[PDB]
Amino acid sequence: KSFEEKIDLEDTGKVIQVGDGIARAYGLNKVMVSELVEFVETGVKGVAFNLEEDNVGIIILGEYKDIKEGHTVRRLKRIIEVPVGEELLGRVVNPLGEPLDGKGPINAKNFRPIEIKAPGVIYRKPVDTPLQTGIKAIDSMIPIGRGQRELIIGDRQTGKTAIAIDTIINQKGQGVYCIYVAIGQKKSAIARIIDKLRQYGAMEYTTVVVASASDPASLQYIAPYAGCAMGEYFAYSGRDALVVYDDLSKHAVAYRQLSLLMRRPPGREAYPGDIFYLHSRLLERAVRLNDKLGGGSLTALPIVETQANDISAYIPTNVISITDGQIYLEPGLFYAGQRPAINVGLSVSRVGGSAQIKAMKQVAGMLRIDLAQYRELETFAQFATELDPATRAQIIRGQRLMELLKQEQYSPMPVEEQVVVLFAGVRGYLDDLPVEEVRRFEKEFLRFMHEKHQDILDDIKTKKELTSETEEKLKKAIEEFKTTFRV
Ligand SMILES: Nc1ncnc2c1ncn2[C@@H]1O[C@H](COP(=O)(O)OP(=O)(O)OP(=O)(O)O)[C@@H](O)[C@H]1O
Numbered sequence: 448k449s450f451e452e453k454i455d456l457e458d459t460g461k462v463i464q465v466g467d468g469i470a471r472a473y474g475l476n477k478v479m480v481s482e483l484v485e486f487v488e489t490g491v492k493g494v495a496f497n498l499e500e501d502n503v504g505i506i507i508l509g510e511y512k513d514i515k516e517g518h519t520v521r522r523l524k525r526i527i528e529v530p531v532g533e534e535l536l537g538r539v540v541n542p543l544g545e546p547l548d549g550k551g552p553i554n555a556k557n558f559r560p561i562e563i564k565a566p567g568v569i570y571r572k573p574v575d576t577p578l579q580t581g582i583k584a585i586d587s588m589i590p591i592g593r594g595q596r597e598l599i600i601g602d603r604q605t606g607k608t609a610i611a612i613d614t615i616i617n618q619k620g621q622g623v624y625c626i627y628v629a630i631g632q633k634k635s636a637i638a639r640i641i642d643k644l645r646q647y648g649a650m651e652y653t654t655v656v657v658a659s660a661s662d663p664a665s666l667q668y669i670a671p672y673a674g675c676a677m678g679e680y681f682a683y684s685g686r687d688a689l690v691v692y693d694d695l696s697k698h699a700v701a702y703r704q705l706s707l708l709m710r711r712p713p714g715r716e717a718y719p720g721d722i723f724y725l726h727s728r729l730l731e732r733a734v735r736l737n738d739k740l741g742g743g744s745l746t747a748l749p750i751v752e753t754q755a756n757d758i759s760a761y762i763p764t765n766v767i768s769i770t771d772g773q774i775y776l777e778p779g780l781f782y783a784g785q786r787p788a789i790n791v792g793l794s795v796s797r798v799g800g801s802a803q804i805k806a807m808k809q810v811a812g813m814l815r816i817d818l819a820q821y822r823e824l825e826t827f828a829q830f831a832t833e834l835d836p837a838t839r840a841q842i843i844r845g846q847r848l849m850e851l852l853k854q855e856q857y858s859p860m861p862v863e864e865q866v867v868v869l870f871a872g873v874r875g876y877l878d879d880l881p882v883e884e885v886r887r888f889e890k891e892f893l894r895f896m897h898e899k900h901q902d903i904l905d906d907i908k909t910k911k912e913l914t915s916e917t918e919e920k921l922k923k924a925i926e927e928f929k930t931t932f933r934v
């Protein structure tokens with residue numbers, strides 16, 4: 448036994464490469480992803496991010512300058528935890544839960560691990576309650592239900608963050624705790640977003656997790672897992688949470704950079720790319736739980752950035768496949784002034800449709816049909832030698848409906864208002880106005896409804912359907928408004 452191996456290879460390891468806040472270890476054969484380890488000599492801790500045999504990747508938490516090749520590493524057998532709960536509402540934190548807003552310590556009473564295994568179907572029940580974004584295009588055509596996974600995808604500067612942040616702003620009074628995860632964005636941009644969340648009153652029920660462009664890849668990589676945990680605190684305690692991952696494209700880039708920081712062991716240059724599994728694990732944690740587990744939910748809104756609208760690229764293909772629905776944004780729409788720049792024909796939300804309230808179902812069906820007919824006709828309309836009156840009417844209706852789907856940033860709309868405005872459209876009441884005046888008509892109409900017909904809005908709101916009685920009154924209110932509207 449003069450030269451026998453001294454260490455336990457399952458729970459103990461040896462640093463074989465260290466630098467730029469990362470280490471690679473021999474041993475630690477039984478370590479799991481996101482498990483804490485300790486560098487014995489220095490007392491510093493780390494978190495496992497890669498389980499390659501005898502080449503385990505470790506994110507060093509804190510001072511890495513003192514860690515040397517040959518140092519012993521020991522499993523702590525604990526998944527790294529973050530503070531979660533009410534104490535984080537109103538706060539801006541990094542992925543480890545440290546405050547970044549100057550408001551003092553968090554003093555959290557609860558903690559959760561950044562990784563858990565997503566519960567199986569036995570623990571879930573069907574999505575049955577809406578998550579109102581307050582954005583007409585989505586709430587009508589791409590309804591989201593609480594517990595689902597909805598992708599927001601499109602090129603840079605198409606309005607992706609805007610949808611997400613407006614959705615958050617709209618959760619005031621909706622009973623939804625919100626977690627906004629900024630991954631890889633510039634500090635300056637993130638600051639602006641936090642300011643808007645503050646200004647529009649969202650921070651009361653919102654936690655912002657930041658790992659900026661200037662933060663290490665390691666923090667960017669941990670960010671969404673920490674954010675999910677923070678949301679799970681509510682989901683698993685009979686409450687509803689929404690977590691925004693902005694964005695998973697930058698997250699994939701950070702995970703890739705982490706892997707590239709250490710060199711490959713000689714004679715093995717290709718370990719598999721499991722970014723698909725990383726995002727799959729993250730998103731499966733969106734859940735609609737059963738009654739025995741409290742009935743709460745966690746809705747996920749991952750964001751993916753495309754290049755040249757290439758939704759066939761790798762990350763896009765991955766996340767499209769592991770989400771229940773997709774909202775597609777496009778630069779052509781954006782540039783034409785169709786904002787939000789959502790392609791409502793291509794976008795889809797399977798699981799949300801049944802959860803959508805009845806009042807909205809009552810107007811979304813016709814909307815969808817009218818837009819379908821419009822887009823068919825637009826195939827050839829501009830090259831038609833002539834179009835009959837009926838066809839012209841269908842085009843006009845369609846142009847009016849598209850105009851109604853335009854909406855300014857930071858202005859999410861109550862569902863009952865969406866309903867009466869979309870009713871006016873689908874029923875033809877904007878057909879005789881110039882298209883350029885639809886926005887104003889909408890603005891003036893809704894003032895008019897509060898001023899003279901609040902009881903209609905109240906009824907739709909309370910009943911969540913448009914009854915025949917209220918429908919008739921609505922028809923008359925619209926006609927009444929038109930009476931005085933100045934074209
Ligand atoms: N509904 C809207 N109406 C008018 N302008 C909007 C709307 N939504 C977003 N914008 C504006 O369009 C621009 C792009 O928005 P945003 O940054 O949310 O898009 P993005 O896809 O997240 O871009 P990035 O690639 O920078 O993350 C911003 O200047 C934003 O203020």
Ligand SMILES: [Cl-]
Nearest residue numbers: 526527528529
């Ligand atoms: Cl911990």
Ligand SMILES: [Mg+2]
Nearest residue numbers: 607608609693
């Ligand atoms: Mg963005």
